[PDB]
Amino acid sequence: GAMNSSNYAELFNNDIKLFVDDTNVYRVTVHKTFEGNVATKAINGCIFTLNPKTGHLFLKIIHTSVWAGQKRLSQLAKWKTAEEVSALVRSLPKEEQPKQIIVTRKAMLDPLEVHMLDFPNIAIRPTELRLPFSAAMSIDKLSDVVMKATEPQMVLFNIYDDWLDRISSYTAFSRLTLLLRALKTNEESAKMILLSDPTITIKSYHLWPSFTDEQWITIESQMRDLILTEYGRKYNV
Amino acid sequence: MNTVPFTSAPIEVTIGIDQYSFNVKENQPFHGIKDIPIGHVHVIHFQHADNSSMRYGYWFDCRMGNFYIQYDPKDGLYKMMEERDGAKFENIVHNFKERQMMVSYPKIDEDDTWYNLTEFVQMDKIRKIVRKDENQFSYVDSSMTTVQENELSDPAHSLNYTVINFKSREAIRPGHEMEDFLDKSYYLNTVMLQGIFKNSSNYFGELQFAFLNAMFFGNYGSSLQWHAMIELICSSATVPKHMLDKLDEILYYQIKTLPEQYSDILLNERVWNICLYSSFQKNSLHNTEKIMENKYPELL
Ligand SMILES: C[C@H](SCCO)C(=O)Nc1cccc(Cl)c1
Ligand SMILES: C[C@H](SCCO)C(=O)Nc1cccc(Cl)c1
Ligand SMILES: C[C@H](SCCO)C(=O)Nc1cccc(Cl)c1
């Protein structure tokens, strides 16, 4: 059934699985009309589909044209996500298709279930974890490719850079979730932490800076401080 | 006016005949039910005094043969039997009537309840659901599972209702996934009405038959089937106007007849609120909505 703290280690076993997050598929700015009414203008979005064991990120970019003339976009977005995940699965060789797909919001279950009826053996599951994948657009290189897209496009990343050379996927995921939680709680502080040292750069083929093992420990400490910090500034504790 | 003769009543039992029920004591001198209206299917049903577990009974049509009930002390139930010797049959019934040993099917002349509950239930169509070809009547009980329940275990003793499953390739056209899931008109009108049932009369008959097995036997798979057939219509944006109007009449008499004290178990809150307040047909079932609101507002 659902995914939570009790079965957390299942993410790093050898059954292929994908997280799907649809938070950033349908994105708008809200603004005033000349008549003083309110209207939205959509902006490009993305589906965040992640293999937590390998770090492979299938970033499907949702170009604003996909909404033209459509109604009920928030509902449509869940079905468009499902359509694109189903298309991704069908494009993968059989030995690469996932045995499970975990959605980060329960409203994706029925759309994805329906789009995957052809794959009765792929388990579609919710989770009780409050994962911070919404913050993916706070990673500059992901935000950049999304905003620059002039047409639908799939881009592939390893969201763990080269981390798996030195640490396990459990640790790699833990780091990623801590970074994304910080970016979600205070993006400016988080980025200042990441980027206040010019001696540590982001390689052209990477998303995050080239921290040594010790620097990552320092960085992780600062991110936990910030999350507690803002949790005080928020709750006055 | 036809008759169902009982050889006797050796065990204390509550006897149902359509929407009526009466008590017979153990070894009471009882020889059956007379004045049964010709032209309708009927159901005769049983609940033993000593074990209200297992309601059971028989769907029959008097035009299809002469039928009698005989208790079987080995299998422990009232069985329906066909008597092929028509003379011997009329002879025994006439003796039982002369001695006034039969209760009277007590139809009030104003009353169209049974007609309205059974308008599209045929006996040959009932046999398509309850498979036992050597008899002209069909046995049902509380515990019989449906062919769909057995997909999720004796196939001989199952109720073969039409399988309805909203998250199935049958229900969903490739390339129309959101369309067909959010508006089930394709599944209703093309898959079910045109390709399985052939007409809405047939669609209503199975729905009527699932309701009555739910109500008279507490048969859970039947209740599931009744609610699924309602929900398929209510969830379709495009339904013939005459099917909606008839559906409203059908459900009205079902809700009217339901025992007040069983509404908590026989009525699915989610389906009914969806159908009356959220679905495409939320404005189309005026009679059903009025009786539901005045009779079971707690379910809503
Ligand atoms: C076959 C047995 S013959 C046993 C008496 O000869 C039977 O009971 N027939 C039947 C016909 C009409 C009414 C009833 Cl209640 C029964
Ligand atoms: C008590 C309910 S209502 C009474 C008739 O409307 C009932 O069915 N009574 C009944 C009594 C004896 C024989 C039969 Cl067939 C019915
Ligand atoms: C098509 C199905 S046969 C079952 C498997 O699909 C059918 O005829 N149902 C039906 C129609 C009228 C009355 C009754 Cl009781 C059932």
Curated annotation (Swiss-Prot), chain A:
- Which compartments is it annotated to reside in? Nucleus
Q: Where is this region: RNase H homology domain?
A: 7-237
Q: Which residues form a coiled coil?
A: none
Look up what happens after changing T23A: Reduced growth at 30 degrees Celsius. Strongly reduced growth at 16 degrees Celsius
Q: How does the record comment on the protein's domains?
A: The MPN (JAB/Mov34) domain has structural similarity with deubiquitinating enzymes, but lacks the residues that would bind the catalytic metal ion.
User: What role does it play?
Assistant: Functions as a scaffold that mediates the ordered assembly of spliceosomal proteins and snRNAs. Required for association of BRR2 with the spliceosomal U5 snRNP, and the subsequent assembly of the U4/U6-U5 tri-snRNP complex. Functions as a scaffold that positions spliceosomal U2, U5 and U6 snRNAs at splice sites on pre-mRNA substrates, so that splicing can occur. Interacts with both the 5' and the 3' splice site, as well as the branch region. Has a role in branch site-3' splice site selection. Associates with the branch site-3' splice 3'-exon region. Also has a role in cell cycle.
Q: What else is known?
A: Present with 468 molecules/cell in log phase SD medium.
How does it associate, per the subunit comment? Component of the U4/U6-U5 tri-snRNP complex composed of the U4, U6 and U5 snRNAs and at least PRP3, PRP4, PRP6, PRP8, PRP18, PRP31, PRP38, SNU13, SNU23, SNU66, SNU114, SPP381, SMB1, SMD1, SMD2, SMD3, SMX2, SMX3, LSM2, LSM3, LSM4, LSM5, LSM6, LSM7, LSM8, BRR2 and DIB1.
| Protein name (Swiss-Prot/TrEMBL) | Pre-mRNA-splicing factor 8
Q: What range of the parent protein does this fragment cover?
A: 1836 to 2069 of 2413
From Swiss-Prot, chain B:
Q: Does the keyword Phosphoprotein apply?
A: yes
Q: What does this protein do?
A: Component of the U5 snRNP complex that is required for spliceosome assembly and for pre-mRNA splicing. Involved in splicing pre-mRNA of the A1 cistron and other genes that are important for cell growth.
* Protein name (database record): A1 cistron-splicing factor AAR2
PTM notes: Phosphorylated on serine and tyrosine residues.
Q: Which UniProt keywords apply?
A: Cytoplasm, mRNA processing, mRNA splicing, Nucleus, Phosphoprotein
**Additional info?**
Present with 7330 molecules/cell in log phase SD medium.
Q: Where can this protein be found?
A: Cytoplasm; Nucleus
Q: Name one GO cellular component term.
A: cytoplasm
Instruction: State the family it belongs to.
Output: Belongs to the AAR2 family.
Q: Where is this region: Leucine-zipper?
A: 244-265
Q: Which Pfam families does the UniProt entry name for this protein?
A: AAR2 (PF05282), AAR2_1st (PF20981)
Q: Which residues are recorded as modified (Phosphoserine)?
A: S236
Instruction: Name a biological process GO annotation.
Output: spliceosomal snRNP assembly
Tell me where on the tree of life, at the top rank, the source sits.
Eukaryota
PANTHER family hit by this protein: A1 CISTRON SPLICING FACTOR AAR2-RELATED (PTHR12689), PROTEIN AAR2 HOMOLOG (PTHR12689:SF4)
Q: Subunit details for this protein?
A: Heterodimer. Interacts with PRP8 (via RNase H homology domain and MPN domain), competing with BRR2 for the same binding site. Component of a U5 snRNP complex that contains at least the U5 snRNA, PRP8, SNU114, AAR2, SMB1, SMD1, SMD2, SMD3, SME1, SMX2 and SMX3, but is not a component of the U4/U6-U5 tri-snRNP complex.
Please give the residue positions where the record annotates the modification Phosphothreonine. Answer: T257
